[PDB]
Write a protein that binds this ligand. Structure first.
Ligand code: ZN
Lengths: 444, 117
């Protein structure tokens, strides 16, 4: 059998490729359905439940959304740093000034050091644009759409020579209650698609994942899409003999039935590459009605992005490749010895959105009126799950454990998945006490 | 394509193409940042997207394409010849594909409650 032959002849099976936290063996296991498991949807009104509202947009509403974004972030930054007042962009001033705006490029290409512009807010600058000169700036990190506060010289009123870049400030963490400290140790498994090789329809990696889930019996399993990839060669050439919907239900039934004996809860997160679903961000939950009474207690459908409380632990779930988009259009002063991923993650956490980049990638549909109400970070998450096409990693940035397990299938060979332990320690201590105690990125 | 957001200037000598929506608006719409006296306009409007989906629903609508025939005799002659009940069901499945996307989205819907009250 030539389909998935290279995958089926893998020898690296079961290998552990990354570990973080406290050293653990290979006998990773949960209690299954034992104990109390709390699964809650959190945040601005809860992570979208209905189908959607619209698919036509009004420019004077996008204008309002962008303006409000800038004003809110600027007001909070002004409160934190205790600055006196903001100066209009076009007003000449011989003394140093403090401007508030958002970063952008002056053309349709990639942003660089020479093409930076700053666009002001409506209240102060009435949406004016000025070039920014970064010759005299020592350390900086900039991407388009970043709401920023600069301090510099602007003598002529047509160009700003930036001299200081104020650092961003993140949101406060979640405040645990008395109940949340009484929860016991739990194990969580995380996987992201695609779940089949690029040359086959067999879905072998899915079966391997189901076998692993049955063996380990974790407490929660979070699965990201796509389940029917829109970029697959057979999908995009329309060689399939069945409707997309039927194939999707087939896959979903295979997943649900195969992990019935485990007793582990299942969470399904949609993707923008799901062919049968709506290709607009943010996405509503999947549609599935063929569930018995038993299965309604173990299967839960959430949106994208989502904020999920698992036993008093906050998880930030997003399927979009934000790391691969932000990193492709981000400029920085230091390139020799610096961590790109940590820097991008710091931008994500301090910008207070699930997608800070504006304008988005070329193939990325965003509805801003719903993006404003359904895609904001409520608090700084305890664990942030960010699947991406880059190499797998687990990093502790700003008190948040950011995990990238990668895709379950990469080209014609298998990928990786991730497992975590969670247990919240005692209330008092040295301020931050991460409820996540051990992470491991493992081969499939 | 519609959600890409490409804006193009209205002046024939400027024709500035951009994906970034300026926050400076004139009376008609966004104000062009290259020539400061003009308005940007969508390259692919919502009316073009709406008309495109209405076209797909129209090339598979055998129900409306039969009442459009002039004589009642010809409509009977081919309804019994090609348009079997099995054939009519096939066109209904292709028609409903374009109708799902048109159902609740794109404001082909008009809300009278907001319009009058
Ligand atoms: Zn123009």
């Amino acid at each position: 059998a030539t389909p998935s032959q290279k995958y089926n002849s893998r020898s690296n099976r079961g290998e552990v490729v990354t570990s973080f936290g406290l050293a653990q063996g290979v006998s990773w296991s949960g209690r299954g359905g034992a104990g109390n498991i709390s699964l809650k949807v959190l945040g601005c009104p809860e992570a979208l439940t209905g189908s959607y509202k619209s698919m036509f947009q009004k420019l004077p509403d996008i204008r309002e959304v962008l303006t409000c974004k800038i004003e809110e972030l600027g007001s909070e930054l002004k409160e934190h740093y205790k600055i006196e007042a903001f100066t209009p962009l076009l007003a000449p001033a011989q003394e140093p000034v403090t401007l508030l705006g958002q970063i952008g490029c002056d053309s349709n290409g990639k942003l660089n050091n020479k093409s930076v512009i700053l666009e002001g807010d409506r209240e102060h600058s009435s949406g004016a644009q000025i070039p920014v000169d970064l010759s005299e700036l020592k350390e900086y990190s900039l991407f388009p759409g970043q709401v920023v506060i600069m301090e510099g010289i602007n003598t002529t009123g047509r160009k700003l020579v930036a001299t200081k870049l104020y650092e961003g400030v993140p949101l406060p963490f979640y405040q645990p209650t008395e109940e949340d400290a009484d929860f016991e140790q739990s194990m969580v498994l995380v996987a992201c698609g695609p779940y089949t090789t690029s040359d086959s329809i067999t879905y072998d990696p899915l079966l391997d994942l189901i076998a692993v889930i049955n063996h380990d019996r974790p407490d929660v399993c979070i699965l990201f899409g796509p389940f029917l990839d829109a970029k697959h060669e057979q999908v995009e050439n329309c060689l399939l003999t069945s409707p997309f919907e039927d194939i999707f239900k087939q896959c979903l039934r295979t997943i649900i039935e195969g992990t019935r004996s485990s007793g582990s809860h299942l969470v399904f997160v949609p993707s923008l590459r799901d062919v049968h679903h709506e290709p607009v961000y943010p996405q509503p939950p999947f549609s599935y009605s063929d569930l018995s009474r038993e299965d309604k207690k173990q299967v839960q459908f959430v949106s994208e992005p989502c904020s999920l409380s698992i036993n008093g632990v906050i998880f930030g779930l997003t399927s979009t490749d934000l790391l691969f988009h932000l990193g492709a259009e981000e400029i920085s002063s230091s390139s020799g010895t610096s961590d790109r991923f940590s820097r991008i993650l710091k931008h994500i956490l301090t910008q207070r959105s699930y997608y800070p980049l504006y304008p988005p990638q070329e193939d990325m549909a965003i509805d801003y009126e719903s993006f404003y109400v359904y895609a904001q970070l409520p608090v700084t998450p305890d664990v942030l799950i960010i699947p991406s096409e880059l190499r797998y990693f687990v990093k502790d940035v700003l008190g948040c454990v950011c995990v990238n397990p990668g895709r379950l299938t990469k080209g014609q060979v298998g990928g990786t998945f991730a497992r975590l332990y969670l247990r919240r320690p005692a209330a008092d201590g040295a301020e931050r006490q991460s409820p996540c105690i051990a992470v491991q990125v493992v081969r499939i | 394509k519609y959600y890409d957001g490409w804006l193009i200037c209205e002046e024939p000598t400027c024709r500035n193409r951009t994906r970034h929506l300026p926050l400076q608006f004139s009376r008609t719409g966004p104000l062009c940042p290259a020539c400061m006296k003009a308005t940007l306009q969508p390259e692919y409007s919502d009316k073009s997207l709406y008309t495109q989906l209405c076209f797909y629903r129209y090339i598979f609508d055998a129900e409306c394409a039969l009442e459009k025939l002039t004589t009642d005799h010809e409509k009977d002659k081919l309804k019994k010849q090609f348009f079997t009940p099995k054939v009519l069901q096939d066109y209904r499945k292709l028609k409903n594909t374009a109708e799902q996307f048109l159902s609740r989205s794109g404001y082909s819907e008009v809300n009278l409650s907001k319009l009058f009250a």
